[PDB]
């Protein structure tokens, strides 16, 4: 799960049913209920990629954009999340359009639930069955990655260890 060459987008994430400190330095290694001094004295694998601004959105019970539309943790949680840098692996010149996210949806999701659909969103009164012009937009939008981006826009590969 950690050394996979291909990582899926956040809207359609992978679900997969030792020592973890032999990797790169970690931007966000925090845990809830259990501590890293208690995990070694102690399972699902859900992984996706998140831009550097909203890495803090992956948290139990807080609102936002990716934490309300794509993947969000319930208020009660015992597992935790590991975030780590990926700039020379998944960012390259010209952009990386493999990593999508969903922006528009009818309502927020149930916990631990994913949605893969390209039904065109409706934001008005006239029913747009298949026309994504004005007042009707495509759900999935892509956010590329270039080496000219700053410290808050790198694609951070991330994974949660649900217990």
């Amino acid at each position: 799960v950690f050394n996979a060459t291909r990582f899926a987008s956040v809207y359609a994430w992978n679900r997969k049913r030792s020592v973890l400190y032999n990797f790169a330095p970690f931007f966000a290694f925090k845990c809830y209920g259990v501590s890293p001094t208690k995990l070694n004295d102690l399972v699902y694998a859900d992984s996706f990629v998140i831009r550097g601004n909203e890495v803090s959105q992956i948290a139990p019970g807080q609102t936002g954009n990716i934490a309300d539309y794509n993947y969000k943790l319930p208020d009660d949680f015992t597992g935790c999340v590991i975030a780590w840098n990926s700039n020379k692996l998944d960012s390259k010149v010209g952009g990386n359009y493999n990593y999508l996210y969903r922006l528009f949806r009818k309502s927020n999701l149930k916990p631990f639930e994913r949605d893969i659909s390209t039904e065109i969103y409706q934001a008005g009164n006239k029913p747009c069955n298949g026309v994504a012009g004005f007042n009707c937009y495509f759900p999935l939008r892509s956010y590329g990655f270039r080496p000219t981006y700053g410290v808050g826009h790198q694609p951070y590969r991330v994974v949660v260890l649900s217990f």
Partner: antibody
Amino acid sequence: VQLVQSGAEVKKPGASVKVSCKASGYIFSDYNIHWVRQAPGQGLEWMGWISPDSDDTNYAQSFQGRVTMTRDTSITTVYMELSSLRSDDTAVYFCARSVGYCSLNSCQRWMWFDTWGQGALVTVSS
Amino acid sequence: PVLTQPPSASGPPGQSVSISCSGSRSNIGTNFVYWYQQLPGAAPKLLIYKNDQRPSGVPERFFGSKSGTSASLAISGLRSEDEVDYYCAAWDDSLSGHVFGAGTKVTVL
């Protein structure tokens, strides 16, 4: 960015074609290489793309089991194999670089062919 | 499920000419459409992308827009360069492959 294709040769039907193009002056691993054919008389037609960091060769539904596309990453080339070419396949062939890079299927909304190499046509008849 | 468009459009110099392009459910109106200009006997290049955007070096007189399941391209100023073939290019999800137009010929009067 510069893309150079090979020349045009005589191919009797039932034989294979040696069509290829190279990448120069830019990083070859971060850009897809789509292929576009064009018969003289009508519009363009799509073939498939190469992801030059793995082995992912997607094709169209019409020519799914007909074409053979192969990466040779050593000398930054992209090779292509068509065996038993037929009379309707007489066309000029382009390889094109798309901006960005994706290997999925629901990622082609932001893919347009930026730069194009010069074409190389193929022949028919015994 | 292929894009359809008039094979040729002719206009006098002095006003613009409009090129229309209509598509199916999975060609236009669910995905972006691009316009490609082909020099005669050479490699075609991008002229319109992202439905209102242009690369640098393209003169600010080429106009394109879409309203429903069809798209329109307008070229203002026709003296010595725009007498070439134009192509309506868009992504298709039904065929899961890139699809193109038949080819529009522009002739001045």
